[PDB]
Amino acid sequence: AQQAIVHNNCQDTVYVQSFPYDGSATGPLTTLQAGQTFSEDFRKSGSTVKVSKTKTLTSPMFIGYSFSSNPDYGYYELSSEWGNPFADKRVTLSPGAGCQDFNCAPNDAGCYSRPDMKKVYGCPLPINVEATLCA
Amino acid sequence: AQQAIVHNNCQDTVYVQSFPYDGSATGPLTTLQAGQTFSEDFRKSGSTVKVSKTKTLTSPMFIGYSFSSNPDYGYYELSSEWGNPFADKRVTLSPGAGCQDFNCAPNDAGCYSRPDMKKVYGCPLPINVEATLCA
């Protein structure tokens, strides 16, 4: 199966949880200590994978993956709309070769998808979507 | 309500035609004199809009669009994968404010979506997908 993956390279522990775009029940609340990795098989409806520094999911960054009419593409989004605990760190999000990455340098807020500057990238299926926190 | 639009600001007559993703009939083969504009209502299934300097649509540029719900995004691609008659001129493709656009300078070949580097963007609905040739 296609994978949504979040690598925690931060010193700090993070919490990751995937909220399907169809609005159904989420995946398990996942604790990632330094060096640990979250992964899940792609949810059929797409999902927003929230990443927070608290168990209560305060002000999470999210990694979104979704699909469209055009059956050829998957779409991914690295968003600071609701917050970003890693704003002073590097965060990368990649669908693999042949498509655009997010490679967001420390303190480069304008690299992320923003409420009034949305950044959602498309890429031919199949894809894995792989992020590193504190790259 | 949403429209896919092609403004021909070039000195040349151009030809535009839409090819629905769901296989329904092609749109009218549209001749745009220098200065004229093509437009169509958003097709539910999405579409490929070919843009060429010949009526036979040989080696055309294309504008691709589609849209989804949950998330409610519209997707748009400015592609030179099949050719680009307007490579020596400026071409823009914008969904309106608040989202990543294409603004492809004259002879900036890498600005377009390419076979080995796809460039497809998403934006919250509703949008008009609006291209200007020789901007």
Side-chain angles (χ1 to χ4, degrees), chain B residues 11-65:
Chain B
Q11 303 261 97
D12 295 327
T13 298
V14 308
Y15 301 84
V16 180
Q17 193 175 19
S18 189
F19 296 78
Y21 284 144
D22 65 5
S24 47
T26 58
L29 181 45
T30 305
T31 304
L32 298 183
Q33 308 297 304
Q36 286 190 306
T37 295
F38 162 90
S39 64
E40 69 173 11
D41 293 356
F42 258 31
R43 295 167 185 276
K44 188 189 52 192
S45 67
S47 200
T48 295
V49 182
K50 300 182 180 178
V51 184
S52 171
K53 290 178 186 176
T54 58
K55 207 170 187 179
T56 54
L57 303 177
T58 295
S59 299
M61 194 194 69
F62 84 77
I63 296 141
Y65 69 88

Side-chain angles (χ1 to χ4, degrees), chain B residues 108-132:
Chain B
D108 187 7
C111 170
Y112 299 83
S113 192
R114 306 285 307 125
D116 48 342
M117 180 53 54
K118 297 290 262 174
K119 288 184 176 177
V120 181
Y121 303 118
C123 185
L125 297 175
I127 60 174
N128 284 337
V129 175
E130 185 170 7
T132 296

Side-chain angles (χ1 to χ4, degrees), chain A residues 38-93:
Chain A
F38 164 91
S39 63
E40 70 170 4
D41 295 351
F42 267 20
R43 289 160 194 283
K44 142 233 266 282
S45 62
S47 195
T48 68
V49 184
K50 300 171 187 277
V51 184
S52 179
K53 283 196 156 176
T54 73
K55 277 172 279 207
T56 50
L57 301 177
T58 64
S59 306
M61 184 193 73
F62 81 79
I63 294 145
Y65 61 91
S66 59
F67 312 100
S68 60
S69 278
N70 178 5
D72 296 323
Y73 298 168
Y75 306 92
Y76 47 100
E77 176 175 18
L78 186 65
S79 168
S80 62
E81 287 168 293
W82 323 130
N84 181 8
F86 316 101
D88 59 347
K89 299 301 184 348
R90 187 176 289 278
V91 180
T92 63
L93 177 63

